[PDB]
RNA sequence: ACGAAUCUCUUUGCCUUUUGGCUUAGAUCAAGUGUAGUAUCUGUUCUUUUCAUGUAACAACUAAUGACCUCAGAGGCUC
RNA sequence: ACAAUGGAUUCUGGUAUGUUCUAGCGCUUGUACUAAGUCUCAUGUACUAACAUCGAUUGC
């Protein structure tokens, strides 16, 4: 029906805070992002003096089948993305719900003209069928390489020196880094410790972490920061031979440090992926030798 | 004109091109309507259990009957059902009424010189020589009887 | 090296392997075919394994 | 960059440049692919494989020659 | 083969779902724009 | 001459890879040479374009690679 | 004693049509020796024109 068409589905947070919004209707505007088929393009601005036009990117049929708005394509209730919506319902019904989309232009147009709901769009747009699953979300919250010749590399890693105040170095050697714990999280924890925040402007610290070798190093400019990095770390572990090592403390993780006393560079950790895995396998013993 | 050209550039041409009937294809569209009417009337005489295979074979007795008509050969199929033979002879006579009357109409046009196609002069010659011999063979049988 | 696909002859040409095509779902029925779908999915994944 | 007029070419010495030789080398590998595909066929005729088999020996000898120059 | 009878005609079900073009035909130009009503 | 089951076989039923338009049968049932056009190969003519012995003394080469150190890749040293 | 004067041009025309032509990486397993191009003429061959070919007189 070209003379009887639904009103558009737009979020409240796309429309924003103001009361009256002048919206422009173009009866066959752009074509839909999803079904590649033309529709009534609505576009508007939040305020009069704004500088960003907010367009409706998809048609109302693709917006109804997913239960999303046309502008930001987030869900109409819960205001979350579709990939996260179908994952949260998957933990409640214990089965995979998923809206699947055709890669084929004759099967993008076919899938839009049917009057079904897709994915979590049966659960959402029914308020009774959505609130009880939020209650079922609440009970979930009540639960709350032996052949490698690695010996050329381990001479350059320190592994035998202590974390004292007295050496004045720029570089350090961070080992026991998990395959999680992203490179930004270690620079933010050090910069929170020194108060040298927005460090990327002045380039106060430079950090290299491999994530295969489970090891890394962080370089400082201006060596007087090195005594600030030593003195602001209180907790240390002493190996039962000696040779105390400081612990950086990312949440639930422990990262050991030794002053390198030279610049490690890239490729100190490894020059091949198969080669770097054995250095993590080399270290895992020394961590167990350091602790136990 | 140019408005049709520019919109055909921006949008492409329509996929719903329905061809009107023409002098070029009136013999083609006549047989499509003639085959559908024969295929309807036989499928309604059938008691049950007739498919796309049995409807496909019966339409070849329609083509064979019209070749026997143009040859002035009596079309008699042994074992043909008498309702279904009655249907085909009704439509072969119907097609013959159009075939003969088109030979009378086009003959009067060729005598007047009033824009007959070069193919149709060879076609009207080929029709009348079948009509002349069919009238000749019928005259032979009236003396023999 | 992967198998190359036959190139599209026209614009809306269809790769039949990528998508179930003009899928028509079996009409919803009163018989709750829920465990049957689990067993068929398990057997299908077992086949492709 | 064109080079269609230029032979394979069986002579090697005439072109001093290696970067140009980079293009000449593909000019050969492509034929290696065409004929190579032309090696297995439903008919599997001896005469067709037999000529292709000789072409393979000729190409492998050329690969030995390029390796020897290096 | 390749010269076939029709098993079914082309339906208007297929042309109804297509998108229109809006091309201007000479026989769809306006003419006889007033209807005549019987007494 | 009536087996509760399997296989093999015979006969009816089923036809299960079991003729998919049209019109003037859609039309016809025929030696060499001559001319014009395109393509390939060979011959000739015309024009254009691609280079430069022996002995003695001196200088350069056989820039790159490896290792160590400083600075935030370069600099120095040795082989 | 007669003054009378129509035309007019474009388009749809044997190779048509059809296919392949991944250089630039998506993480895991696994020092083997010297023929240029263009233009014109001639000859040879192949294809092609859906080209054409019989109009008339005699010394045994
Ligand atoms: Zn859409
Ligand atoms: Zn939105």
Largest sheet of chain C: none
Largest interface: B-E, 16 and 11 residues
Strand content of chain D: under 5%
Class computed from helices, strands and strand pairing of chain C: mainly alpha
Number of beta strands of chain D? 0
Subcellular location (chain C): Cytoplasm; Nucleus
Protein name (chain C): Pre-mRNA-splicing factor CEF1
Subunit structure (chain C): Belongs to the NTC complex (or PRP19-associated complex), composed of at least CEF1, CLF1, ISY1, NTC20, SNT309, SYF1, SYF2, and PRP19.
Organism (chain C): Saccharomyces cerevisiae (strain ATCC 204508 / S288c)
Overall description:
- Chain B: It is found in: Nucleus.
- Chain B: This is Pre-mRNA-splicing factor 8.
- Chain B: It comes from Saccharomyces cerevisiae (strain ATCC 204508 / S288c) (Baker's yeast).
- The structure is cut from a larger assembly and holds chains A (292 residues), B (145 residues), C (49 residues), D (70 residues) and E (39 residues).
- With 292 residues, chain A is of the alpha+beta class.
- In chain A, 31% of the residues lie in helices and 14% in strands.
- In chain A, the strands form two sheets. A six-stranded antiparallel β-sheet of chain A has the order 5-6-4-9-8-7.
- In chain A, 27% of the residues are buried.
- Chain B has five helices and no strands.
- In chain B, helix 2 crosses helix 3 (54-70), helix 2 runs antiparallel to helix 4 (82-112) and helix 3 packs across helix 4.
- The N and C termini of chain B lie far apart (68 Å).
- Chain C has 49 residues and is mainly alpha-helical.
- In chain C, 29% of the residues lie in helices and 0% in strands.
- Chain C is built from one helix and no strands.
- Chain C has one helix spanning 35-48.
- The longest helix of chain C has 14 residues, at 35-48.
- By secondary structure, chain E is low in regular secondary structure.
- In chain E, 13% of the residues lie in helices and 0% in strands.
- Chain E has one helix spanning 12-16.
- The longest helix of chain E has 5 residues, at 12-16.
- Chains in contact: A-C, B-E.
- The interface between A and C is small, with 7 and 8 residues.
- Bound molecules: zinc ion (2 copies).
- Chain B binds two RNA strands through helix 2, helix 3 and helix 5.
Keywords:
part of a larger assembly, 5 chains, D: 70 residues, mainly alpha, 2 helices, E: 39 residues, little secondary structure, binds zinc ion, RNA-binding, Pre-mRNA-splicing factor CWC15 (chain E), pre-mRNA binding (chain A), RNA-binding (chain A), Cwc2/Slt11 (chain A), spliceosome (chain A)
């Amino acid at each position: 029906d070209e003379i009887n068409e639904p009103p558009p589905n737009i979020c409240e947070q796309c429309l924003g805070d103001e009361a009256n919004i002048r919206m422009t209707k173009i009866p066959q505007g752009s074509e839909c992002k999803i079904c590649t088929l033309p529709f009534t393009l609505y576009h508007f601005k939040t305020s009069k003096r704004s500088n960003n036009i907010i367009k409706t990117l998809i048609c109302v049929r693709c917006a109804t089948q997913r239960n999303i708005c046309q502008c930001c394509m987030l869900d109409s209730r819960w205001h979350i993305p579709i990939q996260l919506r179908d994952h949260l319902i998957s933990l409640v019904n214990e089965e995979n719900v998923m809206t699947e989309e055709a890669k084929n232009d004759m099967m993008k147009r076919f899938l839009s003209l049917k009057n079904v709901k897709l994915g979590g769009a049966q659960i959402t747009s029914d308020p009774s069928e959505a609130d009880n699953i939020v209650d079922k979300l609440k009970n979930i919250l009540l639960r709350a390489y032996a052949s490698v010749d690695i010996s050329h590399i381990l001479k350059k890693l320190p592994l035998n020196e202590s974390f004292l105040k007295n050496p004045s170095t720029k570089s350090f050697f961070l080992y026991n880094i998990d395959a999680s714990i992203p490179e930004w999280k270690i620079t933010d924890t050090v910069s929170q410790l020194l108060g040298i925040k927005k460090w990327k402007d002045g380039n106060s610290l430079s950090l290299i972490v491999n994530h295969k070798a489970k090891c890394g190093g962080l370089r400082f400019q201006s060596s007087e920061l090195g005594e600030r990095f030593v003195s602001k770390i209180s907790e240390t572990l002493v190996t039962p031979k000696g040779l105390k090592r400081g612990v950086l403390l990312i949440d639930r993780f422990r990262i050991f440090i030794i002053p390198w006393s030279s610049g490690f560079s890239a490729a100190s950790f490894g020059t091949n992926t198969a080669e770097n895995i054995k250095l993590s396998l080399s270290l895992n013993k020394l961590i167990q030798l350091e602790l136990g | 004109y140019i408005g049709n050209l520019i919109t055909r550039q921006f949008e492409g041409r329509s996929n719903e091109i329905v061809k009107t009937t023409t002098k070029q294809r009136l013999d083609a569209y006549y047989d499509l309507e003639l085959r559908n009417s024969v295929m309807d009337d036989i499928l309604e005489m059938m008691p049950e259990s007739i498919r796309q295979k049995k409807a496909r074979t019966i339409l070849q007795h329609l083509s064979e009957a019209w070749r026997c008509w143009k040859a002035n050969i009596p079309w008699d199929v042994p074992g043909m059902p008498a309702p279904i033979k009655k249907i085909i002879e009704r439509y072969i006579k119907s097609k013959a009424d159009a075939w003969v009357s088109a030979a009378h109409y086009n003959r009067e046009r060729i005598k007047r010189g009033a824009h007959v196609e070069k193919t149709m002069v060879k076609k009207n010659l080929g029709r009348l020589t079948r009509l002349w011999i069919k009238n000749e063979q019928e005259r032979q049988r009236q003396i023999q009887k | 090296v992967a198998i190359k696909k036959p190139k599209k002859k026209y614009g809306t040409d269809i790769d039949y392997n990528e998508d179930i095509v003009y899928e028509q779902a079996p009409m919803p029925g009163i018989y709750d075919t829920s465990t049957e779908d689990r067993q068929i999915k398990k057997k299908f994944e077992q086949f492709e394994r | 960059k064109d080079y269609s007029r230029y032979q394979r070419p069986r002579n090697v010495s005439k072109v001093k440049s290696i970067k140009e030789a980079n293009e000449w080398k593909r000019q050969v590998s492509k034929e290696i692919k065409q004929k190579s595909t032309r090696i297995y066929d439903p008919s599997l005729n001896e005469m067709q494989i037999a000529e292709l088999n000789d072409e393979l020996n000729n190409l492998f000898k050329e690969w030995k020659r390029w390796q020897w120059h290096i | 083969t390749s010269h076939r009878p029709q098993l079914e005609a082309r339906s208007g079900a297929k042309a109804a779902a297509y998108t229109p073009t809006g091309i201007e035909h000479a026989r769809l130009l306006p003419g006889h724009t007033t209807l005549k009503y019987r007494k």
